[PDB]
Design a protein around this ligand. Structure first.
Ligand SMILES: Nc1nc2c(ncn2[C@@H]2O[C@H](COP(=O)(O)OP(=O)(O)OP(=O)(O)O)[C@@H](O)[C@H]2O)c(=O)[nH]1
Ligand SMILES: Nc1nc2c(ncn2[C@@H]2O[C@H](COP(=O)(O)OP(=O)(O)OP(=O)(O)O)[C@@H](O)[C@H]2O)c(=O)[nH]1
Ligand SMILES: Nc1nc2c(ncn2[C@@H]2O[C@H](COP(=O)(O)OP(=O)(O)O)[C@@H](O)[C@H]2O)c(=O)[nH]1
Ligand SMILES: [Mg+2]
Ligand SMILES: [Mg+2]
Lengths: 11, 50, 150, 44, 437, 431, 437
C-alpha cells in the first residue's frame, strides 16, 4: 500500500 | 588414524571421479544442444539459397 | 489459486506451510512478448498510476540438494532397505506436526530434558533393586539353558 | 489458535496474489496467439 | 525376569502400539533414541525396564515388540517418526499388497506369505526372552489384518508355543458407529477362531471412548491419538505390576485364573479412573472410594453397554499410587452393600485386588490429568451378551441374501465358515445366558 | 509399494487425465519439467504410485496416452505439464475417429491395441507390485468407447486379479453433442459390466449444473469440468499416496462398496464447492463438509438421491480432523435419512480419512455412492437406443464396417438386465 | 616366527589379495607404503606382524606375498595404486599373454614359461623366512590361470617343498549363476590335479556370498569388493591365531589334523557369521550363543549348499574378541543337543575351538559393523557331494557332444585326460558316499 499512498499525498 | 587416512584417500578419489563424469555428461549435452541449432540453421540457409 | 481460485479455504502448499527451512524461491522476470522496440497503448483496464511491484507474487520453487537423499526415490528405497533412519526428526524438519500420527512423541526436545523443561511431570520411580542371587540367575539363564539353581 | 490465524493470513496473501496476477493478465497487451500479421503490425 | 512380548497387528494395533510405547518409554526413562540418560539421579540400580526393553550393552534399550501390518503406510510412518531409532528394524514387518477389509484375504492367500517371517522374528525374540510371561496382542475387529492375520498368528502361536498367556486387546465394533461395512462379517469370522486360542480377550469400544472423552475429558473433538493414549494408560496399569514393586502384586498367571471362570467366557472389559482433566482435577478429593465408584459406573464402561442389566462374575481391581488397603476394603464393602452392583450367585467373593506404589505418569500434550491415585477395573460381566446379540443381528441381516460373500468365496474361504461361526457365537450366547441364569 | 497405471484414451479422456496429471504433479511437488522440488518426505515417499524415476532427477508419469488421430496428443504437449510424458507411450492412429464403436473396436482401432498392450506390458512388469489400472474415457465416442472397452477386455483377460477401474464420462440427452451417443453408450456398457472392477460414471450435464450453481462460474469452458473430475480422482487415490488416520486403498473401497459383482457403478462427488463471493462466509468444518457432500448440487453424475435408495456409500476425507466428528456425522446422516438407505445393510457408509489435504483447502472430501438412482441414466440411454434401433437408425456404418445386429440386441438386453438388477434392490424388504 | 606365504593366482586371487592385504596392514598398523605411521606406534616391541610381514632393518615391512596373473591388467593396478610402495617389485609377477579361460593354455603353453620365475621367488621368500607354517593359495577353479597355473604351481611346489601345508582358498562356481561357459571343463580339469597336492581346500561360492550379503547385510547391489572383503575377513579370522595371542591357539597343523579325516576329504566350507550391518548391529546383543547359532543355519553357509541334507565330519570354531570358552562350551552343548544339526556316528568328538582376544578389525568404506565378537566356522560336510554331482552333470552334458574340446586339444591336452578327470571326480563321489554312510 506504500506506492499508492505516494500519489495520495501528491494529490 | 590409519583408517582416517584411507577414508580421506577414498573420499578424494570418489569426488574427483564424480566431478569428472559430471563434466563428461554435461559437455555431451552441450554439444548435442549446439548441434540442434546447427541443423535448423542449415535447413533455413538451404531453403533461402534454393 | 490452485483449486478453482477459492483462495481463502486453507493453504495452497499444505506441507510447505509448516516447514522450518522451506526451499529457496526464485523471483523470476518473464520475457514479456513484444521485442525491445514497440509503442504500448494503455489498455482501458489498468490505470495511469503504477502497477504493483510484483515481487512476492512472481514466485517459483527450485529444488534443494539435501545430503539425506538427492531428491531421488530410488536412493530413498535403498536407504529404506538398508534401514538407515534420517538424521533430523519430525520435530526438527517440521513445525507442529502435519500428520496426526506424529503426535505421539511431539513433546520430545533433543536439547533439553523433560524434567528440566517442565518440572510438573516429575514422577519418582518406585523400583525394587534386584538382589545378588536374582542378578546371578538372570545373567546366567540368558547364556545357558541346562543349568538351574534353586 | 496462532496456527489457524497463520492459515487465515496465507489465505489473504493468496487473495492479494491472485488480484496482482489478474491485473498483470489484464495487462500483457498481446492477447495470447496474436496472429503474425497483427504481431508484426504491433512490432513495427 | 518377568517379561512380555507385544505383537501389534493392523493399523489400529500399530497406532495403539505407538501411543503405548511412548508411554512406556516416558515412564521407564528411556529416551526415543533408546538411551537411558541416568545422569546419576536418584535411581539406584533400576531394573524395571527389563520386562519390555531388551539390553544390548551400550546404554541402548530396545523394546520387545513386533509391529506387523500387511500395508506399508503406517509402518513407514513409524520408521520415519520420532521413535525411529528405538525398535529393531527387522521387527517392523510390512507387506506389499494391502489386505482389504476381508477376513479371507487376511487369513488365506496373502496372510500365509508373511506369517512365517513374523513367527521367525517372534521365535528369535522369545529365545532372547528368559522367562516369558506372555504375549500382548493388539488389534481391531474391523477386519483385514486385525481379524484375519491376527487369528492366523494366534492359531500358529497356540500350536508352537503351548500354554502361554496370550492376552489380547481388541477394538470391538460399536453398536451404531462404524467405519467399514463388512465389520459384522469380520468380527463373526474372527470370534469363532479366537475363542479357542486367546486366554483373555479384552474389549475396547470406540464409541464408548468417544463419549468418555467428550463427557469427562472435556474434549469436544477427540481423535485416535487420545483414544490410543487412554488404551495405553489402561494396558500400562494392567502390566505395571510386572515392573514396579507394590504392596500386593498380581501378574499374567494369577490374572487369568482370577478373571476367567469358564474356558469360553474370557472377554474382560477394562475401564480406567480417573479419566478427569486437570481443570476438574483441581477441584476434587480423588479418594479411593471416589475412584472405585467412578470405575463401577455404566457411563464409564468402555465396551459400551449398561452393566446394570448384567451379573459380575469377577472383577480385577488394579490400584496405583499412594493407595492403602483399608480404603480398598471399605470401598469394596460399600459397593458390595450397594443393591445395584449384584454379583452372580456362585460368587460370594469376586474381587482380585492388586496394589502398586507407582502412580500414573502424565504424558505432556495429553488429555488425562496427572493423578497420585488410579484404579483400573476389569469386569467379567454378562452384559456382553447384548453386544453379541447386536453383532448377530447385524450379521444375519447382512448374510440373509449373501451380501459381500462373493469376495470371500472368490478369495478361497468356503461357504460353510460363515454358518460355522454363526452357530459358534450362538453357542457362546447360550453359554452366557445359562451362566447368567 | 503399490502403483496405479493410467490409461487415458480418447479426446475427453486425454484432456481430463492431462488435467489430472497437472493437479497431482504440484500436489506431489513436481514442476512442469519433471524435477522434484518438494521439501518434505511426505511428498517423496509414494511417488512410485503414479510416477517412474528417470536418470537426472526427472519423474515421468505412468500414463498410456491412447488415441486414433493426431491433434489431441499435440494439444496435450502444447498444454502446461505437457513436456513430462515420455514420447514413447504416445500411441495414436493416423486414420481417425467418427464416433463408431466398430471403428474403435474391430477395425483399424484393433490393429493398434497390440501396441497399447505392449506399452502396458513394458510399463507393468517394469515394477514390482502392480496394484491396478485407471482408465479415463467417454461413453460417446469411437476412441473412448471402442479403445476403452477393448483395453479393459484385453487387460482383464491378461491380469484377472488386480484392481482396474474406469471413469466413464457418460452421455446425456441435453448437452449431447453427438447423435450416435446412445448407440455407443449402450454398446459399451455391455463391455464395462463384466470386465471392470468399478466405474465412476460422470455426467457432463451434472458438471455444467455444478458450474452454473454454487461454483458460480460464468464461462466454464472445458477445463474446469476436468478440474472437478481430477479433484475427484485425487480424493479417491489419496490414501495410497499419503498417510492417514484411517487408510483405504482401491481394493478396500471395492470390497466395502460393491455387494454383488454386477453393481459397480458409483457416483462421484466433491466437497467443498463454494463461490468466490461466498468463499469467506462459511467456515470449513466437518459437518458443513458432510452437508455439502450429501447435497445433490455437488453430485456430478445426475441421479437425484431422493428418487432412489442408497446402497453402500463411501466418503474419503482429506485434512486434519476428528474421527469422533466424522463418525457421528456419518451416523446422523444415516439416522436422519433412514428411508433413503438399504434396510438389509446396516452401517453402510465406508469412512476413510487422510491427514494431507489437497492444495488450496484446509480440508476436503470425496463422495462415491452405489445409489439406486444410477439406473435413471441407463434407463434413458436404453430408451434412446430402443427408439433408434426400432426404425433402423444410423446402422449401415456399423454393419458395413463389420458388426451384426445380434451384438446390438445383446447389448440392449445386457443393459436392461442391469437396469432390472438395480431396480430389484429399490424396494426389497429385509423380512 | 610363525609366518606363512601367500600366493595369489589369477584375477580372482589378485583382487582377494588387494582386499586382504589392506585389512592386514590396517590390522597390524602398517601404512599402505609399508611403514609404521610416523614412528609413533613404536614404543615397545612385538612379533604380531612377523607372520605376514618382514622387517628390512630401517623402517620398512614388505609382505610375504607373491601376486601372479598372466594377463598384465590387474597386477598393474597394484603396481600403480596406493599399495605401490609396499610390495617388492619382483613379487608382483605377471606374464605377456592370457590363458583365455583355458586350463590347457594355462598349464601347458603359457604356464610353462613363468613357473620357473615364480618358483624362484617362492624359494627366495622361503630362504628369507625362518620357520614356515605353510602356504595360502588364493585362486578360483574358474577358468584359465586359476585352474591351469595354480595346479602347475601346486605340482611343482609340492614336489619341491615336501609336506609343507598348502591351504588353498578356491572360488567355486555357482550351482546356476556363473560368468564363463567352460567353467565346468576347467573345474573338472583342475580338481584332478589339485587333489593329491592340496592339504585343505576352502570352498567359497559367489551365489552364497551374494545371498548372505543381500539378506544379512541388506545390500541389494553387491559386488566383488564386498565378496573379497568377506573372504579377507575369513582369512583374518583363520590367521589371527597365528598372529595374535589368544586363550587357545589353532594353527595350520591343527587345521589339517582336525579337519581332514581321510586323505581325500579335505574340502571344507568357511562361514564367517556374525555378519551384520551397522544399523541392525546396534540393536542386537551379538553374543556367543547367537553367533554360534548363526553359523549352523543353511542361509549362512558361504558355499551355496544346504548342510541339513548331509552330515558333518568335523567342525572348527574360531572366536575373536571378548569371548569366553565357557559360553563357547554352552553354545556347543546346545548345538549338540539340537536335532537339526546332524553329525556322523564315527566322530563323537567333532569340535575344535580357538579363542582369541583380538577384536575384529573394521575397514573404512565397508559394510560390516564394528562387532566385539566374531566366529569363523570351518565345516567338513558330506553335503558338498551335491555340488560335485552338479559339476559332473554340467561336464557330462558338454562332453557328450565334445563342446569346447578342440581348444584344449590344440593347446596341448590329450583327448582322454577329460575321461581320467571325470573318473577321478567319480571316485571322489564314491569316497564321499562311503564315508557318509
Ligand atoms: N481405538 C482405535 N481404533 C482404531 C484406530 N485405528 C483404526 N481403528 C479401528 O479400526 C477399524 C478399521 O479397521 P482397521 O483396524 O484399520 O483394519 P486393520 O486391522 O488395520 O487391517 P487393514 O484392513 O489391512 O487396514 C475402525 O473401525 C476403528 O474402529 C486407532 O488408532 N485407535
Ligand atoms: N569373489 C570373487 N570372485 C571372482 C573375482 N574375480 C573373478 N572371480 C571369479 O573368477 C571366475 C572367472 O575366472 P577368473 O578367476 O577370473 O580367471 P583367471 O584366474 O583370471 O584366468 P583367466 O581365464 O586367464 O582370466 C568367475 O566365475 C568369478 O566367480 C573377484 O574379484 N571376487
Ligand atoms: N467433461 C469433458 N467432456 C468432454 C471433453 N472432451 C469431450 N467431451 C465430451 O465427449 C463427447 C464427444 O466424445 P469424444 O471425446 O469426441 O470421444 P472420442 O472421439 O472417442 O475422443 C462430447 O459430447 C463432449 O461433451 C472434456 O475435456 N471434458
Ligand atoms: Mg490399514
Ligand atoms: Mg585372467
Amino acid at each position: 500500500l506504500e506506492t499508492y499512498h505516494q500519489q495520495t499525498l501528491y494529490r | 588414524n590409519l583408517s582416517d587416512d584411507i577414508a580421506r584417500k577414498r573420499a578424494m578419489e570418489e569426488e574427483m571421479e564424480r566431478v569428472r563424469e559430471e563434466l563428461y555428461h554435461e559437455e555431451q549435452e552441450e554439444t548435442q544442444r549446439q548441434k540442434e541449432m546447427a541443423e535448423i540453421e542449415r535447413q533455413i540457409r538451404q531453403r533461402l539459397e534454393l | 489459486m490452485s483449486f478453482f481460485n477459492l483462495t481463502e479455504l486453507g493453504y495452497q502448499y499444505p506441507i510447505r506451510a509448516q516447514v522450518k527451512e522451506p526451499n529457496s524461491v526464485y523471483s523470476y522476470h518473464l520475457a514479456n512478448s513484444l521485442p525491445a522496440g514497440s509503442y504500448v497503448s494503455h489498455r482501458p483496464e489498468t490505470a495511469k498510476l503504477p502497477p504493483i511491484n510484483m515481487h512476492k507474487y512472481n514466485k517459483v520453487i527450485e529444488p534443494v540438494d539435501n545430503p539425506e537423499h538427492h531428491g531421488s526415490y530410488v536412493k530413498f528405497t535403498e536407504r529404506l532397505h538398508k534401514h538407515t533412519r534420517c538424521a533430523k526428526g519430525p520435530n526438527d524438519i517440521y513445525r507442529n506436526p502435519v500428520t496426526t500420527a506424529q503426535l505421539p512423541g511431539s513433546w520430545y526436545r533433543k536439547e533439553v530434558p523433560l524434567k528440566q523443561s517442565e518440572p510438573w511431570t516429575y514422577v519418582p520411580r518406585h523400583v525394587c533393586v534386584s538382589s545378588e542371587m536374582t542378578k546371578f540367575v538372570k545373567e546366567m539363564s540368558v547364556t545357558n539353558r541346562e543349568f538351574s539353581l534353586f | 489458535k496462532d496456527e489457524e490465524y497463520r492459515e487465515y493470513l496465507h489465505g489473504l496473501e493468496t487473495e492479494a496474489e491472485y488480484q496482482a496476477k489478474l491485473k498483470e493478465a489484464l495487462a500483457r497487451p498481446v492477447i495470447d496467439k496474436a496472429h503474425p500479421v497483427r504481431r508484426q503490425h504491433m512490432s513495427a | 525376569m518377568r517379561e512380555c512380548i507385544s505383537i501389534h497387528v493392523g493399523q489400529a494395533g500399530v497406532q495403539i502400539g505407538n501411543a503405548c510405547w511412548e508411554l512406556y518409554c516416558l515412564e521407564h526413562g528411556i529416551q526415543p533414541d533408546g538411551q537411558m540418560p541416568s545422569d546419576k539421579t536418584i535411581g539406584g540400580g533400576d531394573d524395571s525396564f527389563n520386562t519390555f526393553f531388551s539390553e544390548t550393552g551400550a546404554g541402548k534399550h530396545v523394546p520387545r515388540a513386533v509391529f506387523v501390518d500387511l500395508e506399508p503406510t503406517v509402518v513407514d510412518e513409524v520408521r520415519t517418526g520420532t521413535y525411529r531409532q528405538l525398535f529393531h528394524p527387522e521387527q517392523l514387518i510390512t507387506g506389499k499388497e494391502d489386505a482389504a477389509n476381508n477376513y479371507a484375504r487376511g487369513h488365506y492367500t496373502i496372510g500365509k506369505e508373511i506369517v512365517d517371517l513374523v513367527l521367525d522374528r517372534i521365535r528369535k525374540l522369545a529365545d532372547q526372552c528368559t522367562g516369558l510371561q506372555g504375549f500382548l496382542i493388539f488389534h481391531s475387529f474391523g477386519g483385514g489384518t486385525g481379524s484375519g492375520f491376527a487369528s492366523l498368528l494366534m492359531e500358529r502361536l497356540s500350536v508352537d508355543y503351548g500354554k502361554k498367556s496370550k492376552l489380547e486387546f481388541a477394538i470391538y465394533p460399536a453398536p451404531q458407529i462404524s467405519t467399514a461395512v463388512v465389520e459384522p462379517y469380520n468380527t463373526i469370522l474372527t470370534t469363532h477362531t479366537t475363542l479357542e486360542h486367546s486366554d483373555c480377550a479384552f474389549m475396547v469400544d470406540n464409541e464408548a471412548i468417544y463419549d468418555i472423552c467428550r463427557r469427562n475429558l472435556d474434549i469436544e473433538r477427540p481423535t485416535y491419538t487420545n483414544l490410543n493414549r487412554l488404551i495405553a494408560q489402561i494396558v500400562s496399569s494392567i502390566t505395571a505390576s510386572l515392573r514396579f514393586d507394590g504392596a500386593l502384586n498380581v501378574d499374567l498367571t494369577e490374572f487369568q485364573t482370577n478373571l476367567v471362570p469358564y474356558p469360553r467366557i474370557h472377554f474382560p472389559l477394562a475401564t480406567y479412573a480417573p479419566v478427569i482433566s486437570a481443570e476438574k482435577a483441581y477441584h476434587e478429593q480423588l479418594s479411593v472410594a471416589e475412584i472405585t465408584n467412578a470405575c463401577f459406573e455404566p457411563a464409564n464402561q468402555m465396551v459400551k453397554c449398561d452393566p446394570r442389566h448384567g451379573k459380575y462374575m469377577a472383577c480385577c481391581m488394579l490400584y496405583r499410587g499412594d493407595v492403602v488397603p483399608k480404603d480398598v476394603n471399605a470401598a469394596i464393602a460399600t459397593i458390595k452393600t450397594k443393591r445395584t452392583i449384584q454379583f452372580v450367585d456362585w460368587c460370594p467373593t469376586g474381587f482380585k485386588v492388586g496394589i502398586n506404589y507407582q502412580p500414573p505418569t502424565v504424558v505432556p500434550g495429553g488429555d488425562l490429568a496427572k493423578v497420585q491415585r488410579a484404579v483400573c477395573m476389569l469386569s467379567n460381566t454378562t452384559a456382553i451378551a447384548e453386544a453379541w446379540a447386536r453383532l448377530d443381528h447385524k450379521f444375519d441381516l447382512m448374510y440373509a441374501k449373501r451380501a459381500f460373500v462373493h469376495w470371500y468365496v472368490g478369495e478361497g474361504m468356503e461357504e460353510g465358515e460363515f454358518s460355522e461361526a454363526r452357530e459358534d457365537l450362538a453357542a457362546l450366547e447360550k453359554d452366557y445366558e445359562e451362566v447368567g441364569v | 509399494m503399490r502403483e496405479i497405471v493410467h490409461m487415458q484414451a480418447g479426446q475427453c479422456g486425454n484432456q481430463i487425465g492431462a488435467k489430472f496429471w497437472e493437479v497431482i504433479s504440484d500436489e506431489h511437488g513436481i514442476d512442469p519439467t519433471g524435477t522434484y522440488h518438494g521439501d518434505s518426505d511426505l511428498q517423496l515417499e509414494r511417488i512410485n504410485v503414479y510416477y517412474n524415476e528417470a536418470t537426472g532427477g526427472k519423474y515421468v508419469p505412468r500414463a498410456v496416452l491412447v488415441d486414433l488421430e493426431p491433434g489431441t496428443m499435440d494439444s496435450v504437449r502444447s498444454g502446461p505439464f505437457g513436456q513430462i510424458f515420455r514420447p514413447d507411450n504416445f500411441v495414436f492412429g493416423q486414420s481417425g475417429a467418427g464416433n463408431n464403436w466398430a471403428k474403435g473396436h474391430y477395425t483399424e482401432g484393433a490393429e493398434l491395441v497390440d501396441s497399447v498392450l505392449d506399452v502396458v506390458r513394458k510399463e507393468a512388469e517394469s515394477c514390482d507390485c502392480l496394484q491396478g489400472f485407471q482408465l479415463t474415457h467417454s461413453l460417446g465416442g469411437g476412441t473412448g468407447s471402442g479403445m476403452g472397452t477393448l483395453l479393459i477386455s484385453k487387460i482383464r483377460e491378461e491380469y484377472p486379479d488386480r484392481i482396474m477401474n474406469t471413469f466413464s464420462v457418460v452421455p446425456s440427452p441435453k448437452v449431447s453433442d453427438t447423435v450416435v451417443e446412445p448407440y455407443n453408450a449402450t454398446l459399451s456398457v455391455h463391455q464395462l459390466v463384466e470386465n471392470t472392477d468399478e466405474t465412476y460414471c460422470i455426467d457432463n450435464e451434472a458438471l455444467y449444473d455444478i458450474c452454473f450453481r454454487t461454483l458460480k462460474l460464468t464461462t466454464p469452458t472445458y477445463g474446469d469440468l476436468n478440474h472437478l473430475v481430477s479433484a475427484t480422482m485425487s480424493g479417491v487415490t489419496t490414501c495410497l499416496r499419503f498417510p492417514g488416520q484411517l487408510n483405504a486403498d482401491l481394493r478396500k473401497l471395492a470390497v466395502n462398496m460393491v455387494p454383488f459383482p454386477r453393481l459397480h457403478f458409483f457416483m462421484p462427488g466433491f466437497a467443498p464447492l463454494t463461490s468466490r463471493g461466498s468463499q469467506q462466509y462459511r467456515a470449513l468444518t466437518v459437518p458443513e463438509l458432510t452437508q455439502q457432500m450429501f447435497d445433490a448440487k455437488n453430485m456430478m453424475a445426475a441421479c437425484d438421491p431422493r428418487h432412489g435408495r442408497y446402497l453402500t456409500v463411501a466418503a474419503i476425507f482429506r485434512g486434519r480432523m476428528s474421527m469422533k466428528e466424522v463418525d457421528e456425522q456419518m451416523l446422523n446422516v444415516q439416522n436422519k435419512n433412514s428411508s433413503y438407505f438399504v434396510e438389509w445393510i446396516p452401517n453402510n457408509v465406508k469412512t476413510a480419512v487422510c491427514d494431507i489435504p489437497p492444495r488450496g483447502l484446509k480440508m476436503s472430501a470425496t463422495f462415491i455412492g452405489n445409489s439406486t438412482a444410477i439406473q435413471e441414466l441407463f434407463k434413458r440411454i436404453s430408451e434412446q437406443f430402443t427408439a433408434m434401433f426400432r426404425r433402423k437408425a444410423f446402422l449401415h456404418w456399423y454393419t458395413g464396417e463389420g458388426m451384426d445386429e445380434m451384438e446390438f440386441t445383446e447389448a440392449e438386453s445386457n443393459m436392461n438386465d442391469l437396469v432390472s438388477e438395480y431396480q430389484q434392490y429399490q424396494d426389497a424388504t429385509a423380512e
